[PDB]
Design a protein around this nucleic acid. Structure first.
Ligand SMILES: [K+]
Ligand SMILES: [K+]
Ligand SMILES: [K+]
Ligand SMILES: [K+]
Ligand SMILES: [K+]
Ligand SMILES: [K+]
Ligand SMILES: [K+]
Ligand SMILES: [K+]
Ligand SMILES: [K+]
Ligand SMILES: [K+]
Ligand SMILES: [K+]
Ligand SMILES: [K+]
Ligand SMILES: [K+]
Ligand SMILES: [K+]
Ligand SMILES: [K+]
Ligand SMILES: [K+]
Ligand SMILES: [K+]
Ligand SMILES: [K+]
Ligand SMILES: [K+]
Ligand SMILES: [K+]
Ligand SMILES: [K+]
Ligand SMILES: [K+]
Ligand SMILES: [K+]
Ligand SMILES: [K+]
Ligand SMILES: [K+]
Ligand SMILES: [K+]
Ligand SMILES: [K+]
Ligand SMILES: [K+]
Ligand SMILES: [K+]
Ligand SMILES: [K+]
Ligand SMILES: [K+]
Ligand SMILES: [K+]
Ligand SMILES: [K+]
Ligand SMILES: [K+]
Ligand SMILES: [K+]
Ligand SMILES: [K+]
Ligand SMILES: [K+]
Ligand SMILES: [K+]
Ligand SMILES: [K+]
Ligand SMILES: [K+]
Ligand SMILES: [Mg+2]
Ligand SMILES: [Mg+2]
Ligand SMILES: [Mg+2]
Ligand SMILES: [Mg+2]
Ligand SMILES: [Mg+2]
Ligand SMILES: [Mg+2]
Ligand SMILES: [Mg+2]
Ligand SMILES: [Mg+2]
Ligand SMILES: [Mg+2]
Ligand SMILES: [Mg+2]
Ligand SMILES: [Mg+2]
Ligand SMILES: [Mg+2]
Ligand SMILES: [Mg+2]
Ligand SMILES: [Mg+2]
Ligand SMILES: [Mg+2]
Ligand SMILES: [Mg+2]
Lengths: 87, 133, 50, 120, 107
RNA sequence: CGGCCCGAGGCGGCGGGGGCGACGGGCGGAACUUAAGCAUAUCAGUACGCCCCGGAGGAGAAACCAACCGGGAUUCCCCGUAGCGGCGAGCGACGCGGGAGGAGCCCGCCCCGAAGGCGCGCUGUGGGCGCCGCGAGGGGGCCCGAGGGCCCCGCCCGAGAGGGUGCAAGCCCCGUACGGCGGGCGAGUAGCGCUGCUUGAGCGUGCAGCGCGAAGGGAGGCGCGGCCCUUCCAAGGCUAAAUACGCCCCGGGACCGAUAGCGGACCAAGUAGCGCGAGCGAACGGUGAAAAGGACGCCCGGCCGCUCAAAAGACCUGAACCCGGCCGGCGCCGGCCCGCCGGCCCCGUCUCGAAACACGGACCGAGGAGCCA
RNA sequence: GGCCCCGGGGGCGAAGGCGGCGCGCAGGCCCCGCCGGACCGGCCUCUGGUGCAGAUCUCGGCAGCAGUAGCGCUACUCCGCCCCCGGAGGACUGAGGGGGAGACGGGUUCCGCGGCGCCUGCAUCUGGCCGCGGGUGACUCGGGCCUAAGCGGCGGGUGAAG
RNA sequence: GAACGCCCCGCCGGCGGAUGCCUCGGCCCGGGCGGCGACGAAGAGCGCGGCGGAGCGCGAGACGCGGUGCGGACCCGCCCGCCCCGAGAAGCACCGACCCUCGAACGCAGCGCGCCCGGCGCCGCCGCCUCGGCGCCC
């Protein structure tokens, strides 16, 4: 009775929602996330999984501030402002 | 032969430009001839089509003259008055056969302040060119 | 459970709120042929882990 | 349609604040009508945007006031400072980068640059 | 890359008109027993060579001559050949529709 | 009780922290694999893990190379054997020569002594390409659902790159060619002894721990001691260029054409779905020129017919395998007109030898394996 | 990449599909009839991801087998008129319940009205299925507080770092 | 014998989705550029449309607000709205603002609590205020 019967003894939550990455990966007993590594200050990143890397990275979200800053640099008045400051 | 190297001669890019164009470009893309009389008067060869212009059609199976009732810019076509699909009832409504603006010559123009001004702008620029050449 | 935290309540509430079909006037407006919203779910065969 | 930001420009702060209060209570009334007609449901749209315009104007006027209030101090609030990236704020000035020691500068003013041609 | 480098040297030539792109460099003897009897272009002129004609290091640098105070002459013929080169160049230079010399100067 | 010295709490201004599938710098660091076994060797000073900048970075103005009728900081490109090694398998620099680019300098030390950046400092400051806009020039006759088709006569051309338009368009429309604005010289050091790693560096290429520890010193591809010669000045610091590169934008191509090409051409792909989790991860493109997306009548879903060139009716074409209704008849080769007579084991494979009771193979479609350096 | 004698074949019908004759030892080629509805080549020189019966090959479709094998928990019947609802009868679960309620897990499955396209391996007018509206109220119940076994933090210490 | 099965002498139907033609997509090369963050980034959560599920966008000023220019008749359905020598729909470019919770994440915690009526995180540099010492001296 190590198969079907043993499967009927499951009424626990091992992992819950992470506050940083939002995934069902935060371990409720060790108090540490298995996807992004929270509460570590730095994010969990490994070069042996570039598919894991591409799933959540720069660009898969909104890029709101960086988007505005880049357009301002490439075509707006920002480098002129830099010249005025650096005078 | 082209010489300018910021302009594609690539069919994929040109077809994607023709679709997914923005509204101003699409409006400019929907132009047609002026007739000979308006060519003499305004000294201009082509205009963007508009509601309130009277159009004379050829080269199609729906040939005639009528006023522009609607402009279907997604399709790049115009719904003219009187030019319809043949209906089934004697009663049932008309249904316009959509004409493509390059199958027409504009016969009489809708005028307002902006139309007047943009025409005069275009004449002065063509005059700059004619003075250069 | 009858004893649930507000955060789990709110995420469950959003799943319930968004589990809906495409409006018919939206189908007419946007000129769609696909009319099923394939992000719907049913409680019997789902495994929402929220 | 609805109120114009130009027609709110040049109006007193209390006229503006009372007009905002009126618009807020109006959106309450209109939302109550929604939960309980073409003109009404158009007015709901126009009134959301009228609220937005009044608040826009109030903030702009207050900002101009404050930026005059702090115009010539040594320490400016960080909101009114130039718009520059982190890196630019941290870069050295062109004068600082072109500063030269005294002995180097003296020997550079001796024998400056010269235009000359060389023939075949 | 060929085009990129040509564009860069065109821009620099415009900027510094009517100076040449290159400095005056000395004539030196190749190092081996195998390359013993032929000359090539060196790095700079020695202070002994400059003392030959009068110029100081700063003055020569200003009028456009590479100067290498680390090199030492190995004989008197080195000096005679390079002083002839310096003397002739100082003959042929003008100082301010002018002509901008191209390529290496006095190959 | 005050000064100086060494500390403690608070306040103000300013700075740091995190983020990236490349390029760049510093550390730690495998095994598979090859040697036809396997220990040194190789793979490889690679994968991977940790730290750190930038638009480049690092390196850099000789304690250099050489042995010449000598060169002269750094980087990068072309070019080519000394040597290392169970001296096996393997491994491996560089100078001279031709080019790209080219640029040089200052602290300590010594003299003056607050002349300084003055609440500090005499335990030493200061001096010696992108933004705009104009833009030429074809009709007439047949026929088609539709003229970009056929026949006959023309125009523009600094423009016959191309895209669209109901069928192959320089002249039906956007564009294309020709132009305007912004523009006096460094000490727990050098070196040496023992040990560990690393290198082509071989009685030591470079580094390091520990013990010892200098004064004129370093180097000259075989050790030790002596005399010479040639050539440099370590143990402090700054520095442009020529060089390298993903993301994103721009242009091009003897590349792929929906089981191909990215996993991803489809209003909602790292999506739906699966795993406690780390993580794994699909399938699905195409009506018609126009939605004109199906009249009227009759039965009680069907029939008639309607739009359209055409149902192309949930859609381009529409093969095979397999099946239903009507009609005809009852395996390959050969002769004969035609159901007789004659001949004929299941291919592919390993094997001395296969019809084998040796193995693979129900059927059908599409894909599928000696190319490149 | 070229040529195709007033500038190669094409809605007066291209490619492809289905039958039929002819040519070639053969690989294959050519023509005709019907479908289809917009592109296609013969000769010279150049290039390659260039030819299938098999790999317990990959992906997709699919046959015979075959209307075959198969559809614990005692039980339904008559009438109004379906296994639904009502009335009458006959039984069962048998207080460690096929009863009444909580914890965990699920997440709207809850309620009313409507319905049968999917599901309800038979049916359905039933329904945890589908559509449209709704719905959970605290000074006194629990959580928030306390501490258990534990876990983290602490001038600092160590390690090439993490 | 019929029928079943099989072959096709031909004519029609199914099931399936090959072949042909097409392509707002991939891949390769080259050129640009090299522009984040405590002034709160990258990323995550939740919410926002007149009828509004997904994706894009936006942030309680929420399917967006203002200023300067250009542009000049539409706005996919149903509704509104605009229409004019300027009255101004679609669209474009810069600039000014708004900018909920978590996150280097900053009163503690993660959804519950404080100390105090301004507000209240850590490290470092330079100043300054208030202080300790049987350190050296007076
Ligand atoms: K079991
Ligand atoms: K964990
Ligand atoms: K509950
Ligand atoms: K469930
Ligand atoms: K920055
Ligand atoms: K290693
Ligand atoms: K190994
Ligand atoms: K081994
Ligand atoms: K081995
Ligand atoms: K080994
Ligand atoms: K070895
Ligand atoms: K080894
Ligand atoms: K060997
Ligand atoms: K040079
Ligand atoms: K046309
Ligand atoms: K010492
Ligand atoms: K030592
Ligand atoms: K070695
Ligand atoms: K050796
Ligand atoms: K020792
Ligand atoms: K020697
Ligand atoms: K050596
Ligand atoms: K030696
Ligand atoms: K795929
Ligand atoms: K075999
Ligand atoms: K065998
Ligand atoms: K055998
Ligand atoms: K056989
Ligand atoms: K055999
Ligand atoms: K046998
Ligand atoms: K047998
Ligand atoms: K057999
Ligand atoms: K065999
Ligand atoms: K066997
Ligand atoms: K075998
Ligand atoms: K067999
Ligand atoms: K190919
Ligand atoms: K069976
Ligand atoms: K019902
Ligand atoms: K350490
Ligand atoms: Mg546990
Ligand atoms: Mg081996
Ligand atoms: Mg090696
Ligand atoms: Mg550097
Ligand atoms: Mg080694
Ligand atoms: Mg694919
Ligand atoms: Mg079909
Ligand atoms: Mg078998
Ligand atoms: Mg095949
Ligand atoms: Mg192949
Ligand atoms: Mg075979
Ligand atoms: Mg009983
Ligand atoms: Mg119910
Ligand atoms: Mg059933
Ligand atoms: Mg109580
Ligand atoms: Mg949405």
């Amino acid at each position: 009775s190590k198969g079907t019967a043993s499967f009927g003894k499951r009424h626990t939550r091992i992992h819950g929602s992470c506050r940083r990455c939002g995934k069902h990966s935060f371990h409720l007993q060790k108090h540490e996330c298995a996807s992004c590594g929270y509460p570590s200050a730095k994010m969990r990143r490994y070069n042996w999984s570039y598919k894991s890397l591409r799933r959540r990275t720069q660009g898969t979200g909104s890029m709101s501030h960086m988007r505005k800053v880049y357009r301002a640099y490439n075509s707006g008045t920002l480098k002129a402002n830099a010249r005025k400051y650096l005078a | 032969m082209k010489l300018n190297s910021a302009v594609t001669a690539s069919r994929r890019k040109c077809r994607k430009a023709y679709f997914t164009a923005n509204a101003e470009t699409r409006a400019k893309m929907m132009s047609s001839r002026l007739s000979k009389e308006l060519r003499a008067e305004h000294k201009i060869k082509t205009m963007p089509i508009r509601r309130g212009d009277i159009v004379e059609i050829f080269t199609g199976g729906h040939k005639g003259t009528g006023k522009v009732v609607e402009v279907r810019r997604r399709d790049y076509k115009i719904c003219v008055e009187g030019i319809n699909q043949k209906a089934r009832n004697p009663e049932a409504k008309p249904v316009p056969y959509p004409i493509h603006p390059s199958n027409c010559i504009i016969k009489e123009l809708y005028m307002n302040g902006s139309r007047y001004r943009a025409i005069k702008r275009r004449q002065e620029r063509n005059a700059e060119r004619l003075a250069r050449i | 459970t009858a004893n649930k935290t507000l955060s789990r309540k709110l995420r469950l509430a959003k799943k319930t709120k968004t589990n809906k079909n495409i409006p018919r006037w939206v189908i007419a407006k946007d000129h769609l042929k696909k009319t099923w919203n394939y992000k719907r779910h049913h409680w019997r065969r789902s495994h929402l882990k929220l | 349609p609805g109120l114009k930001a130009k027609d709110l420009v040049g109006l007193s702060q209390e006229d503006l604040q009372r007009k905002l209060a009126d618009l807020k209570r109006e959106l309450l009334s209109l939302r109550t009508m929604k939960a309980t007609v073409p003109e009404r449901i158009a007015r709901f749209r126009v009134c959301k945007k009228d609220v937005a315009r009044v608040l826009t104007v109030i903030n702009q006027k207050a900002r101009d006031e404050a930026r005059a209030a702090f115009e010539g101090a040594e320490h400016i609030p960080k909101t009114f400072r130039p718009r520059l990236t982190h890196a630019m704020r941290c870069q050295l000035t062109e004068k600082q980068k072109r500063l030269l020691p005294s002995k180097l500068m003296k020997r550079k003013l001796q024998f400056p640059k010269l235009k000359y041609a060389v023939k075949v | 890359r060929k085009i990129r480098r040509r564009q860069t040297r065109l821009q620099k030539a415009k900027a510094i008109f009517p100076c040449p792109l290159q400095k005056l460099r000395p004539s030196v003897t190749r190092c081996s027993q195998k390359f013993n009897l032929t000359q090539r272009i060196g790095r700079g002129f020695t202070l002994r060579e400059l003392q030959g004609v009068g110029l100081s290091a700063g003055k020569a640098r200003q009028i456009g001559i590479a100067v290498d105070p680390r090199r030492k002459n190995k004989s008197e013929e080195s000096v005679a050949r390079n002083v002839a080169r310096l003397k002739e160049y100082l003959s042929k230079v003008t100082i301010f529709q002018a002509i901008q010399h191209q390529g290496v100067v006095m190959p």
